[PDB]
Structure formats: C-alpha cells, structure tokens
Design a protein around this ligand. Structure first.
Ligand code: C2E
Length: 286
C-alpha cells in the first residue's frame, strides 16, 4: 500500500525539518492533505489538542470553506473524552478523528464537516483512525532525549506497541524475525549484513540472548505473510551476494525464528516468543 509509503513520505519530511520549531505546526498542511486523500474529504480542519484534552480554537490547516469550533460540540466532546473516532448517526460535525500516540496522548484533532456519503462508512473511518495513530507516533519525536534508553530501543518499543494496537484494533499484520547467530566466525559480518538490509519503517534491535549469542531482532510493521516471505527472499539474495552463491544462510550459523502478530493469538504469546523462545528479557524489549 501507499499507506507504508505515505507514512515513509511523512517521516522523511519530518526528518528534514529545521529542528527548531514544532512538527505539528510545520507539517499540518501535509498531514491534513494525507487525511483528506485517504478519507476523500471535502470540508475539514486540523487542530492542536492541549495536554488536558481540550482543542486549540484556531485550526492548523484548512480544507474547503471550514467554520470554527463552536463550543464543546457533542462530537468534539465525545471524541476527546473517548479518545476514539466518533461520527454522527448516519441517518442525518460529520466525523471527529483524534490523533493519538501509543502512550494515549492526543496530539491533534481532525474535524470533518463534509465527505462524500458513499465513503462515509466504517471502512473509511478505519483507515482514518489507522492513519491518525501512525501520524501521532511520528510527530511524537521529542522528550526521548530525556530517557536513558538508546534511540533504537525507544523506536523499536514504540513501533512494536503500535503494531500490537494495529493488530488488536484493526487486524493489521506485522511480523517479527529473530536472527540468532550461532557461529562466531561469521556472526559479526552476518549482523552487519542484516543491519544494512533495513528498509523503510522496519526497526531492529541488536541483542545478546541468555546463551551469549548475537540476536538481531527485526520488526516489520504492516507486513502480511506474503511479503514477510518477500523479505526473506530478498535477504537470501543479499546473503548469496555477500557470502557464497554456493552457500546458504543457515551454513553461516543463522537460526531463524519468526512470529506473526495476530489478534487471534493468545495475549501471552508475543512474550512467550521473545522471552524463553528467543531467550531475551524485559530489559531488552518492552
Ligand atoms: N517489511 C518489509 N517487507 C519487505 C522487505 N523486503 C521485501 N519485502 C516484501 O517483499 C516484497 C518484494 O520485495 P522486493 O522483491 O524487494 O521488491 C520491491 C523492490 O524492488 C521495490 N522496493 C520497495 N521498497 C523499496 C525500497 O525502500 N528501496 C528500494 N530500492 N526498492 C524498494 O519495490 C518492490 C515491491 O515492494 P513491496 O510492494 O513493498 O513488496 C515487498 C515487500 O512486501 C523489507 O526489508 N521489509
């Protein structure tokens, strides 16, 4: 999908930002255009939402002839109280979509007054809420350089939690691969090759399991089983280049463990997979 790409588009617009103002302010037009592109919206506004869940009166960006927030509008009110997307009774201030990061913090409000009736359904609402959540996360970029954990640990943890929320609420797929490197002669060069393979939005952790062996953990957000397979196919081609074509990944001591995130999975399953299947612990992944 252009979902991954649009998010990658936005993230790398953010990564080029001066770094001296505020992402919500600088990117509000593009954020709204994104939300509009996906919801086929005609009249809408993007609004900052302050720490105590009250909306900032003046819109960050407009789309079409768009009137102001009148008061504690029922739809705006329930949106920010429930922290969920709220829309009016179909049988008709059309939709209110909050942008909420993985910590539950509301960063913004998409307030819609007009969108084609034929798209005013659960399918489009879902896509709006998905996009809102991911955009909220990418704007989060701050207060992290006041945490002891490395930037890679922080990112991995947020992306993983977003992936679990996406599986739980929207049935969106993601995959984890743990590469355990069992042969010390090849381990470092294999890990370097895996680190260099990282592509858009996948996030990695460089770890050591309980048995002292290198483990390179890779999360693939928004990635189906098709596709996790495309990833491994790509990776084997890269290994063939780096090491023998005459040779396979497993002959370098690579053991692969894979976990597919599924809302249907038991609640303890991801923890079972990482801790004691992969031999990792809660100080490494949280
Ligand atoms: N999460 C994740 N999934 C992966 C990865 N590598 C492969 N896949 C999955 O396998 C499919 C085939 O990838 P490909 O053969 O590299 O074929 C790719 C590749 O030729 C090109 N492409 C996509 N993204 C990039 C990129 O960031 N850089 C470059 N150079 N090419 C890309 O577009 C083709 C289609 O890509 P997709 O539709 O995304 O479909 C991809 C994707 O679903 C990965 O590192 N992470």
């Amino acid at each position: 999908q252009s979902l991954r790409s649009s998010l990658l588009g936005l993230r790398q617009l953010l990564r080029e930002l001066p770094g001296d103002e505020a992402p919500l302010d600088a990117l509000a037009e593009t954020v709204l255009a994104l939300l509009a592109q996906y919801g086929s919206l005609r009249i809408a506004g993007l609004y900052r939402v302050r720490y105590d869940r009250t909306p900032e009166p003046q819109p960050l960006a407009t789309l079409g002839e768009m009137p102001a927030l009148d008061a504690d509008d029922l739809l705006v009110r329930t949106c920010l109280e429930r922290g969920e997307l709220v829309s009016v009774r179909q049988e008709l201030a059309a939709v209110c979509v909050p942008l909420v990061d993985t910590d539950g913090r509301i960063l913004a409000l998409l307030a819609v007054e007009q969108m084609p009736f034929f798209v005013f359904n659960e399918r489009t609402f879902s896509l709006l809420a998905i996009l809102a959540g991911h955009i909220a996360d990418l704007l989060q970029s701050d207060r992290r350089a006041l945490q002891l954990a490395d930037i890679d640990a922080q990112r991995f943890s947020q992306y993983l939690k977003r992936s679990l929320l996406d599986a739980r609420d929207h049935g969106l797929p993601a995959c984890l691969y743990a590469f355990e490197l069992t042969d010390a002669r090849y381990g470092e060069e294999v890990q370097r090759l895996l680190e260099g393979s990282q592509r858009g939005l996948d996030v990695q952790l460089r770890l050591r399991n309980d048995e002292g062996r290198r483990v390179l953990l890779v999360l693939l957000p928004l990635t189906s089983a098709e596709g996790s397979q495309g990833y491994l196919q790509r990776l084997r081609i890269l290994f063939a280049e780096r090491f023998g074509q005459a040779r396979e990944l497993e002959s370098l001591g690579v053991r692969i463990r894979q976990y597919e995130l599924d809302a249907g999975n038991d609640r303890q399953a991801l923890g079972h997979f990482l801790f004691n299947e992969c031999g990792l612990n809660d100080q490494q992944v949280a």
